[PDB]
Design a protein around this ligand. Structure first.
Ligand SMILES: Nc1nc2c(ncn2[C@@H]2O[C@H](COP(=O)(O)OP(=O)(O)O)[C@@H](OP(=O)(O)OP(=O)(O)O)[C@H]2O)c(=O)[nH]1
Ligand SMILES: [Cl-]
Ligand SMILES: [Mn+2]
Ligand SMILES: [Zn+2]
Length: 687
């Protein structure tokens, strides 16, 4: 009976994977089910059934979406790392590096009930994890979905905070990745736990009026078929489910059983844009227009085109989405559950992230997305998002100037740890202060945040020029200790490289740049000891380990572009090698310019935005075809606009090689028009 429940659930998963997975792939997925069963032996859920029944049910949801074996294995083991004695290394052993990273990723999106729930921070963290590997968010959405269905076993106190997090981030996130059925199901379960009484009243009315609503939807499908025929418009009509739109409305509105019965939604697929406008004109003649949105002339972020018109005919209300056969096909590039692999959807997910905006917050996210932060907490549960490699001092300054300036030590998870201790995500940090304490300048050696570095440089701003050179040497000697080296280990050849590399003449002047200038002692150490035993390699730019970097908005450098960094009081700013802002500051201060190289010419987990100016006028059908051609080439369409002389397109590409392929494919498709790549978006569109 207890083991027999697990076996009949495992057998139900086998039926789903047997048709589409290979014999060896099915054995690997079923082996993960046996290992998950072993890790959770004896553990039972709040309802009483064995724990493994949950990841099995989650893996069944994913197997029904025909997802890859790694996704299914990671879902079956996503709770064995934290809830069990088993570790990430155990998973790397039995199932490989890919499933371990997926399990790790899903685990990172978990919200502790005793820690702060910050909507904006969680949105950023989830968006970052999604763009790093979209499979992680699909597993997490399936996990959250299964939890929402069994929320009855949890206390009504708990039921609210989870339904709120699901509603605030998971529902928008599932729509973003094209999992609209999942998003609707999640939103339904959110209403069930956020307003049970109003939910039960609306659901019962929906259920009682369901057969009558079917009858009238069939009537209106025929009336719409007749209308298209009368106006000589060729098109297809699809009946759409409108249960979530009706529930969403009547949960906040007074009940009108006639409005609930006679409200229908349809999708109309036409042959051309001229027919779309012709149908809109025809509909206006026969109905009263409630709402109209033109997403053909103004396409949605991501590139989605459609005409959304809400009509009223007496008791009847119709919600119609009208689009061409090409628009419907373009929309199926970027959906994580479509023909394309979820990972190829990265560009589409990132281009359409402008659809989530709650404030211009999802406007300048590039630095955050490419550089995973650490999530450490105050003993009160307060979140602090810090760069990778941040020490206790960085946390102290992040909390406040008082705590940073007067810090003497810290208690990490109850254990006393010194001020240079690098932090790890999930740690609770208690800064120990002394009102008589003064910040020590030697902290610069391990400091990686700008709030901490600037606050320490204010103490050296009133110090002796000789003492500054000493502090700079003290900070460089400690930065070298990370690689088992020191200043006495530096040969004359090592010093000669540093002085030439920093456009400087003496050793004391290099120390002045570390102590008072904007040269971080970590960048000096990473240049002398390159790619050898540096203590999650998130780094896209070589030698920037332990420090956070920023992309300049003047030139917007993309992976693969020749780049050069600029050392400022805000950190290191990455610019394209021929940016006019960069060359201006290189002429004035060549010592503040550091040459930079991208670690790998083609990293697949990152996406950037390229700005294009196509020297040709494009009509409605040509713009629609341009969006299609971009999306078909795994490049998301962030924005398109066409005047009578040019057509601008902001496109989300992987690297400089990808944008070269897109430009080359667009040129031969359009009869070789001139296409120029801009440094920043044109003022005609935004800017
Ligand atoms: N809905 C439901 N949940 C159950 C049941 N039995 C155990 N749980 C677990 O309760 C957890 C709820 O998370 P918290 O809000 O942190 O509650 P907690 O502090 O008591 O763990 C879930 O962890 P999780 O999967 O990691 O989700 P989460 O921690 O990301 O919310 C879920 O696995 C049950 O019968 N129904
Ligand atoms: Cl020009
Ligand atoms: Mn779980
Ligand atoms: Zn620049």
């Amino acid at each position: 009976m207890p083991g027999e429940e697990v076996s009949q659930a495992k057998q139900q998963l086998k039926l789903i994977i047997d048709p589409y997975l290979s014999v060896s792939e099915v054995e690997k997925v079923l082996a993960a089910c046996d290992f998950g069963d072993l890790a959770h032996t004896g553990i039972t859920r709040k309802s009483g059934e064995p724990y493994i029944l949950h990841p099995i049910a989650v893996s069944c949801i994913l197997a029904n979406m025909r997802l890859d074996p790694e996704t299914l294995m990671a879902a079956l083991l996503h709770d064995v790392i934290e809830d069990t004695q088993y570790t990430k290394d155990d998973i790397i052993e039995r199932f490989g590096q890919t499933v371990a990273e997926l399990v790790d990723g899903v685990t990172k999106l978990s919200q502790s009930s005793d820690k702060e729930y910050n909507k904006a921070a969680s949105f950023r963290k989830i968006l970052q994890a999604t763009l790093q590997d979209p499979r992680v968010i699909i597993i997490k959405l399936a996990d959250r979905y299964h939890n929402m269905t069994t929320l009855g076993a949890l206390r009504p106190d708990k039921r609210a905070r989870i339904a709120q997090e699901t509603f605030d981030i998971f529902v928008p996130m599932a729509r973003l990745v094209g999992m609209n059925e999942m998003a609707d199901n999640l939103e339904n379960l959110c209403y069930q736990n956020l307003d049970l009484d109003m939910f039960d009243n609306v659901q019962n009315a929906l259920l009682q009026t369901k057969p009558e609503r079917c009858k009238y939807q069939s009537i209106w499908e025929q009336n719409l078929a007749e209308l298209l025929h009368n106006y000589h418009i060729q098109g297809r009509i699809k009946k759409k489910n409108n249960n979530i739109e009706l529930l969403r409305h009547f949960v906040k509105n007074e009940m009108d059983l006639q409005e609930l019965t006679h409200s229908h939604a349809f999708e109309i697929v036409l042959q051309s844009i001229a027919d779309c406008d012709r149908l809109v004109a025809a509909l206006k003649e026969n109905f009263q227009v409630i709402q109209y949105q033109d997403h053909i002339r103004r396409p949605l972020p991501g590139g989605n085109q459609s005409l959304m018109i809400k009509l009223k005919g007496e008791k009847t209300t119709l919600s119609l989405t009208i689009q061409t056969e090409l628009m419907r096909k373009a929309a199926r590039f970027g959906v994580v559950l479509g023909e394309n692999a979820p990972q190829t959807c990265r560009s589409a997910i990132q281009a359409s992230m402008q659809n989530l905006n709650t404030l211009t917050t999802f406007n300048d996210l590039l630095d955050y997305l490419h550089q995973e932060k650490i999530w450490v907490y105050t003993p009160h549960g307060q979140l602090h998002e810090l760069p990778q490699g941040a020490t206790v001092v960085d946390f102290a300054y992040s909390a406040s100037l008082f705590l940073g300036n007067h810090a003497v030590g810290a208690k990490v998870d109850g254990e006393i740890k010194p001020l240079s201790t690098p932090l790890v995500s999930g740690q609770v940090i208690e800064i120990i202060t002394d009102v008589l304490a003064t910040p020590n300048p030697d902290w610069l050696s391990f400091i990686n945040t700008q709030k901490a570095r600037r606050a320490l440089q204010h103490v050296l701003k009133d110090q002796d020029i000789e003492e500054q050179r000493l502090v700079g040497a003290q900070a460089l000697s400690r930065a070298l200790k990370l690689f088992n080296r020191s200043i006495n280990d530096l040969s004359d050849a090592d010093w000669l490289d540093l002085l030439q590399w920093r456009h400087i003449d003496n050793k004391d002047a290099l120390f002045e740049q570390i102590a008072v200038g904007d040269l971080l002692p970590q960048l000096v150490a990473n240049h002398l000891f390159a790619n050898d035993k540096h203590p999650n390699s998130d780094r896209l730019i070589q030698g920037t380990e332990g420090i956070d970097v920023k992309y300049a908005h003047c030139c917007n450098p993309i992976l693969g572009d020749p780049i050069q960094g600029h050392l400022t009081r805000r950190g290191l700013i990455v610019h394209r090698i021929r940016c006019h802002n960069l060359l201006h500051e290189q002429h004035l201060h060549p010592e503040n310019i550091m040459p930079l190289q991208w670690k790998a010419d083609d990293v697949d987990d990152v996406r950037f935005t390229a700005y294009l100016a196509i020297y040709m006028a494009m009509n409605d059908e040509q713009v629609s075809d341009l969006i299609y051609q971009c999306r078909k080439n795994n490049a998301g369409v962030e924005m398109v606009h066409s005047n009578e002389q040019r057509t601008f397109v902001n496109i989300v590409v992987n690297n400089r090689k990808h944008i070269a392929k897109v430009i080359r494919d667009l040129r031969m498709h359009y009869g070789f028009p001139r296409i120029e790549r801009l440094d920043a978006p044109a003022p005609q569109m935004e800017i």
